[PDB]
Amino acid sequence: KTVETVLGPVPVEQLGKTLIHEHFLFGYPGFQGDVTRGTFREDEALRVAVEAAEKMKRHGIQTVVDPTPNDCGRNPAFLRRVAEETGLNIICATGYYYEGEGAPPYFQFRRLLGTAEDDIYDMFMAELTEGIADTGIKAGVIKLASSKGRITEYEKMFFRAAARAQKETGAVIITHTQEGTMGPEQAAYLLEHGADPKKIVIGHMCGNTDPDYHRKTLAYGVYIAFDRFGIQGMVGAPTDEERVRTLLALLRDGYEKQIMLSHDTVNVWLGRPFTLPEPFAEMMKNWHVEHLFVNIIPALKNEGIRDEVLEQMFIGNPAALFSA
């Protein structure tokens, strides 16, 4: 009936139009060490955050799930400030990034002491039911991620703990797949440990452009997300054209009730500011929160997708997802 947000519990019946995967703040593990030259300009970040939030509300968005990992600059207190100033419902997460590019030394160590999984589970429980640090803010989703072509042994501890925290709380699990791989695998592993398919969102599915891969994942009964619209070139990612084609093939097969969309934007980059080289800066031109509403959805309508299906993805699916 309710889900935890940065401002406290909110009736699931009130989430409304939802972007399932966006980042107000984000930093690659290691930015913390570049504090001297890559300081966090609080007020400016919030200005940028707030504008982004306002651009979403301008298109009907009422809720955003910001799944920024514990080791990537998660900052509930800052999210709360954005929520207080915009009225936007913001749901944060608990979880670590994938091994390829996260901060694994800490828990790899506890793995030697043979307590990692229990410690992780203890962490998920605490952030899901008591609060994150001394902020009083609880996380609404468990964030998981796997590497390219494999779910490492390090990542499996997080998956097992996730399934266990989910059995206990009925918390939603959101995942990150790397370069269109491991979708079916993530679902199988999570289900094999008792996780509830109706509470799982396998992310970055748009990373694979072969519908049989999607169908193979959809068969486990989970939700999947085409959440990187706008990201082009970088990460051997596909194109928005390919994304649409794949999405169209699924919508026509009748999978609308298992599909969600988002951009996966990074509104304020943590650490030192950088600028992307000419070639890529161009292909990423549409990587912003208004992209789905200004370019993608109009495109889907010309292709015959009707309003009822769009509402199912942006309002109905999130509603079902967050309610047992």
- 176 touches Co ion (CB under 5 A): yes
Q: Which of 90, 103, 187, 296 binds a copy of itself (CB under 8 A)?
A: 103
- 71 touches Co ion (CB under 5 A): no
Q: Show Cβ contacts of residue 35 under 8 Å, excluding neighbours closer than 6 positions.
A: none
Q: Return the residues of window 134-153 that contact a copy of itself according to CB under 8 A.
A: 134
Looking at this protein, which amino acid is placed at residue 321?
A: L
- Of 8-16, 132-140, 259-267, 284-292, the window that binds a copy of itself (rule: CB under 8 A) is 132-140
Give the Å distances, CA to CA, from 199 to 114, 170, 196, 291, 317: 29, 7, 5, 27, 11
- 39 touches a copy of itself (CB under 8 A): yes
* Cβ contact 321:198 at 8 Å: yes
CB of 89 to a copy of itself, least distance (A): 22
Residue 119 interface partner, choices Co ion, a copy of itself, none, CB cut-off 5-8 Å depending on type: a copy of itself
CB of 204 to Co ion, least distance (A): 6
Task: List the beta bridge partners of residue 241.
Answer: none
- 36 touches a copy of itself (CB under 8 A): yes
Q: Evaluate the CA torsion angle 231, 233, 234, 237 in order and state its sign.
A: positive
Residue whose CB is less far from Co ion, 240 or 264:
264
Give start and end residues of each alpha helix (H) in the chain: 42-57, 76-86, 105-112, 116-129, 153-169, 183-192, 211-218, 240-252, 278-283, 291, 297-302, 307-311, 317-321
- 4 touches Co ion (CB under 5 A): no
CB of 97 to a copy of itself, least distance (A): 8
Q: What is the DSSP string of 71-118?
A: GGT--HHHHHHHHHHH--EEE-EE----GGGS--HHHHHHHHTT-HHH
Residue 264 interface partner, choices a copy of itself, Co ion, none, CB cut-off 5-8 Å depending on type: Co ion
Residue 273 interface partner, choices a copy of itself, Co ion, none, CB cut-off 5-8 Å depending on type: none
User: Which residues would be at the binding site for Co ion (CB under 5 A)?
Assistant: 176, 264
User: Which residues would be at the binding site for a copy of itself (CB under 8 A)?
Assistant: 27-37, 39, 69-71, 74, 96, 100-110, 113, 115, 119, 122-123, 126-127, 130-134, 271-272, 274-277
